[PDB]
Amino acid sequence: TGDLINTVRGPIPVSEAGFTLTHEHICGSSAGFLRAWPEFFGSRKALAEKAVRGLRHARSAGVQTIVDVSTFDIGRDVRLLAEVSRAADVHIVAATGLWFDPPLSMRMRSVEELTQFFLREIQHGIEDTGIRAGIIKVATTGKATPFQELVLKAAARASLATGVPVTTHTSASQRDGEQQAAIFESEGLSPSRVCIGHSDDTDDLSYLTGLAARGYLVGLDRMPFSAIGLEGNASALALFGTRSWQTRALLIKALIDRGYKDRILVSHDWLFGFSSYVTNIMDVMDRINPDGMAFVPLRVIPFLREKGVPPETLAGVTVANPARFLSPT
Amino acid sequence: TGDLINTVRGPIPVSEAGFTLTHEHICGSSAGFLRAWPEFFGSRKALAEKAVRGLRHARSAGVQTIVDVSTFDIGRDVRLLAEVSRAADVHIVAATGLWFDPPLSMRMRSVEELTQFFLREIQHGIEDTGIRAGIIKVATTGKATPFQELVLKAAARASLATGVPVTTHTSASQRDGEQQAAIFESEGLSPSRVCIGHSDDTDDLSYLTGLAARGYLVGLDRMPFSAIGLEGNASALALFGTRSWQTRALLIKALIDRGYKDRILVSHDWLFGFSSYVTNIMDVMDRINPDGMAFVPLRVIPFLREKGVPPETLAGVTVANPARFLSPT
Ligand SMILES: CCOP(=O)(OCC)Oc1ccc(OC)cc1
Ligand SMILES: CCOP(=O)(OCC)Oc1ccc(OC)cc1
Ligand SMILES: [Co+2]
Ligand SMILES: [Co+2]
Ligand SMILES: [Co+2]
Ligand SMILES: [Co+2]
Q: DSSP string of A73-141? A: GGT--HHHHHHHHHHHT-EEE-EEE--S---HHHHT--HHHHHHHHHIIIII-STTS-PPPSEEEEE-S
First-residue to last-residue Cα distance in chain A = 15
B268 is in an annotated binding site: no
Handedness of CA B151, B152, B157, B162 (dihedral sign): positive
Name the residue among B172, B169, B142, B171 with its Cα closest to residue B155: B169
CA torsion, points B193, B196, B198, B202, in degrees to nearest 10?
-150
Q: Is B272 exposed, middle or buried (0-12, 13-18, 19+ CB in 10 A)?
A: buried
Measured CA distances, A272 to A24, A225, A316, B85, B115 (Å): 10, 15, 28, 39, 25
Name the residue among B162, B172, B214, B218 with its Cα closest to residue B191: B214
Yes or no, beta carbons of A108 and B39 under 8 Å apart: no
Measured between beta carbons, the chain A residues lying within 8 angstroms of B278 are 108
CA–CA separation, A35 vs A54, rounded Å?
22
Measured CA distances, A177 to A97, A237, B14 (Å): 17, 23, 59
CA–CA separation, A31 vs A77, rounded Å?
9
A91 is in an annotated binding site: no
Please tell me the number of the ligand nearest to residue A24's CA. Answer: 4
> Looking at the domain B1-329, which fold is it?
TIM Barrel (3.20.20)
* 3-class secondary-structure state, position A218: strand
φ/ψ region of B89 (left if φ > 0, alpha if ψ in -120 to 50, else beta) reads left
Yes or no, beta carbons of A101 and B106 under 8 Å apart: no
CA of B70 to the centre of ligand 6 (A): 7
Measured CA distances, B261 to A48, A54, B178, B223, B251 (Å): 54, 61, 20, 17, 11
CA–CA separation, B109 vs A85, rounded Å?
30
CA–CA separation, B229 vs B72, rounded Å?
34
Measured CA distances, A292 to A30, A120, B128, B160 (Å): 21, 32, 30, 42
Amino acid at B131: I
Amino acid at A275: S
Q: Which atom of ligand 2 is the closest one to the Cα of B222?
A: 2
Beta-carbon neighbours within 5 Å of ion ligand 5: B 169
Q: Is B141 exposed, middle or buried (0-12, 13-18, 19+ CB in 10 A)?
A: middle
* 3-class secondary-structure state, position A11: strand
φ/ψ region of A125 (left if φ > 0, alpha if ψ in -120 to 50, else beta) reads left
CA–CA separation, A295 vs A293, rounded Å?
5
Residue B233 distance to chain A (closest CA, Å): 16
Measured between beta carbons, the chain A residues lying within 8 angstroms of B108 are 275-279
Query: Cβ(B170)–Cβ(B72) under 8 Å?
Result: no
DSSP state for residue B295 in the 8-state scheme: H
Amino acid at A329: T
Yes or no, beta carbons of B104 and A30 under 8 Å apart: yes
Using alpha carbons only, what angle is made at residue A159 by residues A155 and A162, rounded to the nearest 5 degrees? 140
Name the residue among A253, A237, A272 with its Cα closest to residue A58: A272
Query: Cβ(B317)–Cβ(B213) under 8 Å?
Result: no
Q: Could you tell me which residues are beta bridge partners of residue A4?
A: A13
Residue A40 distance to chain B (closest CA, Å): 9
| B147 CB-near residues (< 8 Å, 6+ apart) | B102, B107
Using alpha carbons only, what angle is made at residue B26 by residues B131 and B204, rounded to the nearest 5 degrees? 110
Of B105, B113, B275, the CB nearest to A276: B105
CA–CA separation, A264 vs A249, rounded Å?
12
Query: Cβ(B97)–Cβ(B118) under 8 Å?
Result: yes
Q: Which atom of ligand 2 is the closest one to the Cα of B269?
A: 5
Query: Cβ(B229)–Cβ(B293) under 8 Å?
Result: no
Q: Which atom of ligand 2 is the closest one to the Cα of B274?
A: 7
Report the residue of B25, B96, B104 to disrupt the A interface, i.e. the one with the largest count of A CBs within 10 Å. B104
Yes or no, beta carbons of A33 and B105 under 8 Å apart: yes
CA of B30 to the centre of ligand 6 (A): 13
CA–CA separation, B130 vs B128, rounded Å?
6
Find the closest chain B residue to A117 by CA distance: B37
Amino acid at A9: R
Using alpha carbons only, what angle is made at residue B282 by residues B276 and B285, rounded to the nearest 5 degrees? 120
Yes or no, beta carbons of A279 and B101 under 8 Å apart: no
**Which residue, judged by its Cα, is nearest atom 7 of ligand 1?**
A28
Query: H-type helices in B258-320, by residue range?
Result: 281-288, 295, 301-306, 311-315
CA torsion, points B151, B153, B159, B160, in degrees to nearest 10?
-160
CA of A192 to the centre of ligand 4 (A): 20
The sheet with strand B20-24 has its strands ordered as B20-24, B65-68, B91-93
CA of A159 to the centre of ligand 1 (A): 24
Resolution for this model in angstroms, one decimal place? 1.9
- What kind of experiment solved this structure? X-ray
| B116 CB-near residues (< 8 Å, 6+ apart) | A39
Query: Cβ(A226)–Cβ(A288) under 8 Å?
Result: yes
CA–CA separation, A277 vs A27, rounded Å?
12
Measured CA distances, B227 to B133, B176, B197, B238, B285 (Å): 33, 23, 20, 8, 9
* 3-class secondary-structure state, position B93: strand
Query: Cβ(B261)–Cβ(B313) under 8 Å?
Result: yes
